[PDB]
Amino acid sequence: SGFRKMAFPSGKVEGCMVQVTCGTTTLNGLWLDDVVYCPRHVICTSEDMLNPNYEDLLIRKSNHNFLVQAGNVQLRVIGHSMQNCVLKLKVDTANPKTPKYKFVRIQPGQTFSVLACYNGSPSGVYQCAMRPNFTIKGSFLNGSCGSVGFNIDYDCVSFCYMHHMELPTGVHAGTDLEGNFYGPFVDRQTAQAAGTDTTITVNVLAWLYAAVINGDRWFLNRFTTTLNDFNLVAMKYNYEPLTQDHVDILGPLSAQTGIAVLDMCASLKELLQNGMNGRTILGSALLEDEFTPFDVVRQCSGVTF
Amino acid sequence: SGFRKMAFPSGKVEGCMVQVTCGTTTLNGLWLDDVVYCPRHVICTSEDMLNPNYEDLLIRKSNHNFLVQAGNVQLRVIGHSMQNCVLKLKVDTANPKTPKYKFVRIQPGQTFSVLACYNGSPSGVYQCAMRPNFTIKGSFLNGSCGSVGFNIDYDCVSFCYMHHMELPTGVHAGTDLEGNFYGPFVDRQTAQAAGTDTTITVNVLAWLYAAVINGDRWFLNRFTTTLNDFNLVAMKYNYEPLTQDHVDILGPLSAQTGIAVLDMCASLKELLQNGMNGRTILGSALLEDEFTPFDVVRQCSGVTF
């Protein structure tokens, strides 16, 4: 029993983290097979970030300008290329610690673990979610760029996020491992405001199921609702509309607990309209939306890797 | 910027996790040098746990009764001994992945990372704290026993916790790596109720400093207090008394932010007496007490390992 915000074990990713330095800028890179992936703004000075022309800046760089260090040992760079907002540095040695891996582009609402790194060295690991406005709420200091987000399925690491930017509002933006930003953000120091940070309804419902499984059941009530009626309330409170697809994804948790999805929606509706009255659910005084249905099933069943 | 509940990177500990089976019971063990550490109740059946005589039960076990598996490979057990509530299984092969390590017994209020494991396989990593009543609020299912808690200082893993028991109230109890339980708990399935779960005041204050460093400052007020006056309020709200030692530990955060410790105490006093009025601090609607002062300094400065 007990339910915690849990990250994936980070060892398989720790073995892939390297330091990349170009001129005066140092950040993190991801070393998989004989390629190191990192943010293309490693080629930029602080001045450059206000209005960078990446193709022009890259012309002034050669292979030997990219200093790649794995722990204490230097890697030899034998080619480089830009793909969208990432650089791919071809090195002469395949990483012997390369795990089974895939690159995935995740959808808003999906969760992943972040290995925060500085100078190629891991500092910590935590769980977060791709927000509906395509930001993430991370913990990234200067030098953390190139830190990655990932999920693990048994033996295979699915990399989904590379950190690039902090917005002036303190939230974070980055790319998939093909170098395409999530959402509308760009790797330039300019005015980019995030859209509404809406709540991930299906994740809140999943977490309410986790709460029931673990004995927190005060919020269960005598009511039910419909999708359309629930969604009138979701709109008022800046929650994502619940779809039939979401109802289907919650099917396993509904079956396990015997609580119909629409009955849990009616519990959520009452929590939205009346608040929690100073009570807590799974140690939280607000409705948590960074556990997916699959996260809840995984943690409640003990799936390993 | 951003502040997250962050666990230590778990790779160094993942490389030490093994499966231990004795008769019909399987749990996790920790393989360091040529010793595997695990809970002594691996020798117990479900019946045994109601009133176990461990010395008598252990007499019926030999080295070959302890099946130790590291991934897919079996380890040869060449001796075994009981130390308090742990078993030490001497194996014929030193773990080649043994990190630099120490065994530490932590004090209440201190935090650590847990690598939840099942059948010797890591499932997830999360941060928690030794509560003042000597329980922890973890996420442990059947088979998680022997999972460990740890801190990392650069290259050295300090192991501080091994999981043994879930209390009927759903909180968790375990030992240090010398096999001594934290608090009054015993490895028997009996009535053990936890004492008051008091709030770790110095950690709440540290987290308020983290909030100010990251821009959340609405709770700062025009007031100050004294230690004795603050402690009258702490007692009323089941907070640990704040000592001069705690004030000294918060010195670095006070210096960095320019907010005197007693001024932050007065902010906390107002938060206790008036609540948060539906507002949040660092994404939380309650006062968080599982970040130590050293955790805040570490995460706010980017310390790596």
Side-chain angles (χ1 to χ4, degrees):
Chain A
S1 78
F3 202 76
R4 275 280 184 179
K5 184 73 68 52
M6 180 171 300
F8 289 99
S10 58
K12 289 169 184 277
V13 179
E14 290 169 53
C16 299
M17 299 311 304
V18 299
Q19 179 183 260
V20 184
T21 303
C22 179
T24 72
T25 302
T26 292
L27 41 62
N28 304 282
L30 184 71
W31 181 23
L32 298 168
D33 307 317
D34 63 345
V35 182
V36 173
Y37 304 81
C38 68
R40 68 176 177 172
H41 73 77
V42 75
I43 70 180
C44 280
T45 73
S46 287
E47 221 186 320
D48 288 322
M49 286 306 289
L50 301 165
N51 192 18
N53 187 309
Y54 283 96
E55 292 282 12
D56 291 341
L57 292 171
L58 194 55
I59 288 176
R60 312 294 155 200
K61 301 304 183 178
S62 291
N63 288 333
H64 70 267
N65 291 126
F66 294 96
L67 303 182
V68 183
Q69 194 172 330
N72 195 226
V73 305
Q74 209 70 18
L75 297 184
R76 187 178 299 275
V77 179
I78 63 172
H80 65 279
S81 59
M82 182 163 54
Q83 183 188 8
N84 307 304
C85 293
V86 296
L87 297 181
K88 296 190 284 184
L89 307 177
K90 186 72 111 181
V91 291
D92 76 348
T93 303
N95 182 357
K97 305 180 183 162
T98 304
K100 283 192 62 220
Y101 74 94
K102 304 172 162 53
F103 290 169
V104 302
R105 184 173 179 84
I106 56 163
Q107 284 293 117
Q110 290 304 117
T111 57
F112 57 94
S113 296
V114 172
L115 179 65
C117 292
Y118 299 90
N119 307 113
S121 283
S123 171
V125 68
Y126 57 87
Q127 192 69 357
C128 64
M130 178 63 55
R131 304 305 311 175
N133 66 5
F134 299 101
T135 66
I136 71 170
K137 295 181 108 74
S139 170
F140 294 104
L141 295 176
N142 194 86
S144 62
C145 291
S147 289
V148 300
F150 59 97
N151 286 275
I152 304 180
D153 173 57
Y154 284 72
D155 49 349
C156 184
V157 183
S158 287
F159 293 102
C160 57
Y161 179 84
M162 174 166 286
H163 183 56
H164 288 242
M165 306 288 288
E166 186 164 76
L167 305 189
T169 58
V171 302
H172 301 112
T175 67
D176 63 20
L177 269 294
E178 294 173 3
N180 289 305
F181 267 88
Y182 286 100
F185 303 111
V186 297
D187 50 356
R188 179 190 175 163
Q189 185 179 137
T190 181
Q192 340 189 40
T196 308
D197 201 353
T198 71
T199 299
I200 309 153
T201 307
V202 67
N203 289 6
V204 178
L205 289 166
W207 170 82
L208 289 176
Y209 279 106
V212 170
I213 290 166
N214 284 277
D216 282 0
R217 302 151 181 171
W218 62 262
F219 53 84
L220 295 182
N221 58 37
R222 294 176 170 279
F223 318 137
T224 199
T225 186
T226 68
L227 225 42
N228 287 340
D229 174 66
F230 177 80
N231 282 337
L232 295 178
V233 182
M235 177 145 299
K236 175 182 171 84
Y237 289 93
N238 287 336
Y239 270 55
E240 282 304 289
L242 200 71
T243 69
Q244 189 59 44
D245 274 358
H246 293 142
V247 175
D248 295 341
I249 294 162
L250 292 162
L253 289 168
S254 179
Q256 188 192 323
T257 67
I259 299 172
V261 175
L262 290 177
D263 295 359
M264 195 66 86
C265 289
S267 282
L268 176 52
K269 173 174 157 194
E270 297 300 307
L271 288 166
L272 289 173
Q273 291 174 338
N274 302 300
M276 293 160 65
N277 284 126
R279 290 186 292 282
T280 59
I281 299 173
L282 291 178
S284 177
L286 47 74
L287 301 164
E288 297 283 338
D289 78 344
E290 301 199 350
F291 296 97
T292 68
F294 293 107
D295 291 338
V296 173
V297 168
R298 191 182 311 114
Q299 184 175 163
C300 291
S301 70
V303 176
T304 47
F305 306 98
Chain B
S1 78
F3 202 76
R4 275 280 184 179
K5 184 73 68 52
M6 180 171 300
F8 289 99
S10 58
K12 289 169 184 277
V13 179
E14 290 169 53
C16 299
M17 299 311 304
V18 299
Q19 179 183 260
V20 184
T21 303
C22 179
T24 72
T25 302
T26 292
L27 41 62
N28 304 282
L30 184 71
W31 181 23
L32 298 168
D33 307 317
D34 63 345
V35 182
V36 173
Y37 304 81
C38 68
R40 68 176 177 172
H41 73 77
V42 75
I43 70 180
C44 280
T45 73
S46 287
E47 221 186 320
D48 288 322
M49 286 306 289
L50 301 165
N51 192 18
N53 187 309
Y54 283 96
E55 292 282 12
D56 291 341
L57 292 171
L58 194 55
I59 288 176
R60 312 294 155 200
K61 301 304 183 178
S62 291
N63 288 333
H64 70 267
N65 291 126
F66 294 96
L67 303 182
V68 183
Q69 194 172 330
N72 195 226
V73 305
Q74 209 70 18
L75 297 184
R76 187 178 299 275
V77 179
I78 63 172
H80 65 279
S81 59
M82 182 163 54
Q83 183 188 8
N84 307 304
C85 293
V86 296
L87 297 181
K88 296 190 284 184
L89 307 177
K90 186 72 111 181
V91 291
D92 76 348
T93 303
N95 182 357
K97 305 180 183 162
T98 304
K100 283 192 62 220
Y101 74 94
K102 304 172 162 53
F103 290 169
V104 302
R105 184 173 179 84
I106 56 163
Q107 284 293 117
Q110 290 304 117
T111 57
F112 57 94
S113 296
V114 172
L115 179 65
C117 292
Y118 299 90
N119 307 113
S121 283
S123 171
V125 68
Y126 57 87
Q127 192 69 357
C128 64
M130 178 63 55
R131 304 305 311 175
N133 66 5
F134 299 101
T135 66
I136 71 170
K137 295 181 108 74
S139 170
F140 294 104
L141 295 176
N142 194 86
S144 62
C145 291
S147 289
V148 300
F150 59 97
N151 286 275
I152 304 180
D153 173 57
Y154 284 72
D155 49 349
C156 184
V157 183
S158 287
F159 293 102
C160 57
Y161 179 84
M162 174 166 286
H163 183 56
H164 288 242
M165 306 288 288
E166 186 164 76
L167 305 189
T169 58
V171 302
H172 301 112
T175 67
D176 63 20
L177 269 294
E178 294 173 3
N180 289 305
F181 267 88
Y182 286 100
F185 303 111
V186 297
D187 50 356
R188 179 190 175 163
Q189 185 179 137
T190 181
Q192 340 189 40
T196 308
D197 201 353
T198 71
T199 299
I200 309 153
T201 307
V202 67
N203 289 6
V204 178
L205 289 166
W207 170 82
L208 289 176
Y209 279 106
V212 170
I213 290 166
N214 284 277
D216 282 0
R217 302 151 181 171
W218 62 262
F219 53 84
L220 295 182
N221 58 37
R222 294 176 170 279
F223 318 137
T224 199
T225 186
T226 68
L227 225 42
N228 287 340
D229 174 66
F230 177 80
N231 282 337
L232 295 178
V233 182
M235 177 145 299
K236 175 182 171 84
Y237 289 93
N238 287 336
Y239 270 55
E240 282 304 289
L242 200 71
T243 69
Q244 189 59 44
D245 274 358
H246 293 142
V247 175
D248 295 341
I249 294 162
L250 292 162
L253 289 168
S254 179
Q256 188 192 323
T257 67
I259 299 172
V261 175
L262 290 177
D263 295 359
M264 195 66 86
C265 289
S267 282
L268 176 52
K269 173 174 157 194
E270 297 300 307
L271 288 166
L272 289 173
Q273 291 174 338
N274 302 300
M276 293 160 65
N277 284 126
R279 290 186 292 282
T280 59
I281 299 173
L282 291 178
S284 177
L286 47 74
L287 301 164
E288 297 283 338
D289 78 344
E290 301 199 350
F291 296 97
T292 68
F294 293 107
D295 291 338
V296 173
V297 168
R298 191 182 311 114
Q299 184 175 163
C300 291
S301 70
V303 176
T304 47
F305 306 98

